[PDB]
């Protein structure tokens, strides 16, 4: 009962191998280190809400989420969506510096796993679109379980 | 170490509120009762592999999966995909009768939660396409956590 708080860190990261939906939305559960990733065609507020809808189904509802001040995260729409769910939102400190370091380490382990699985399949450039889906699933698998 | 075996039961179920991608692929982890659902436009073998790719990222790799003899599940393609992952597959007994009862109970709790959340939003018929995604996320959330 003295366990970790259910706080998430989310961010978006660009990955051209995953084009056209090359914007990967990544969420790290700081309680368990689990990771949830979704792809999007454009960074929008709505992209951020859809990514969270999916992470919540997978991780359960957090008590809070930390993001940077990107505008897709502090727009009105996003504040209202998070309010409707009852989740608190913080963008940390104005000149944070650090503080979002797990989601950033996550971003880097993820892109690396994607490159190594993609190349294992013989794709050295963009991944065929029909194949990105299982590859992105496979990457997430590899970083969360086995 | 005497805990339950990681065996899944998967099935596809039709849901017109979710049209055009009205075929919902549902997987129950018989170890934890967690549920994973994905939508598809057509019931194909490939639909079954994509659904599992996503469930594995979410639940980890099972030791076995039980399905009925639908052809999308015993086709060559599907047998080879499951073989590549190292998961055993069984379709149970020829005139099983029961044995897939959790995935079927799941199918029914799911469609019911979708109807009640959809109607809470004022959609009494098909759900606008742009809205199905979070609604399907929301349903899964409700049946797995809170
Ligand atoms: Ca950012
Ligand atoms: Ca069936």
Swiss-Prot record, chains A, B:
Bound how, and how many: what does the cofactor note say? Binds 8 Mg(2+) ions per integrase homotetramer. Zn(2+) can also be a cofactor for the nicking activity, but not for the polynucleotidyltransferase activity.
Protein residues bound to Mg(2+) 3: 11, 68, 104
Its needed co-factors are: Mg(2+); Mn(2+)
Q: Which residues form the Integrase catalytic domain?
A: 1-146
Out of the domains of life, which is the source?
Viruses
Its biological purpose = Catalyzes viral DNA integration into the host chromosome, by performing a series of DNA cutting and joining reactions. This recombination event is an essential step in the viral replication cycle. Has a strong preference for using the 3'-OH at the viral DNA end as a nucleophile.
Its subunit composition reads: Homodimer; further associates as a homooctamer.
- Domain notes, please? The core domain contains the D-x(n)-D-x(35)-E motif, named for the phylogenetically conserved glutamic acid and aspartic acid residues and the invariant 35 amino acid spacing between the second and third acidic residues. Each acidic residue of the D,D(35)E motif is independently essential for the 3'-processing and strand transfer activities of purified integrase protein.
Q: What's the name of the protein?
A: Integrase
Annotated source species: Rous sarcoma virus subgroup C (strain Prague)
């Amino acid at each position: 009962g003295l366990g970790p708080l259910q706080i998430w860190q989310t961010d978006f990261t660009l990955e051209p191998r995953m084009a056209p939906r090359s914007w990967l939305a990544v969420t790290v559960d700081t309680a368990s280190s689990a990771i949830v990733v979704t792809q999007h065609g454009r960074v929008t507020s709505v992209a951020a809400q859809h990514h969270w809808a999916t992470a919540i189904a997978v991780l359960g509802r957090p008590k809070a989420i930390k993001t940077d001040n990107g505008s897709c995260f502090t727009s009105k729409s996003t504040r209202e969506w998070l309010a409707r769910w009852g989740i608190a939102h913080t963008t940390g400190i104005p000149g944070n510096s650090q503080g979002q370091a797990m989601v950033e380490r996550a971003n880097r382990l993820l892109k690396d796993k994607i490159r190594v699985l993609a190349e294992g399949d013989g794709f050295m450039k963009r991944i065929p679109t029909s194949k990105q889906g299982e590859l992105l699933a496979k990457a997430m698998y590899a970083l969360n379980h086995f």
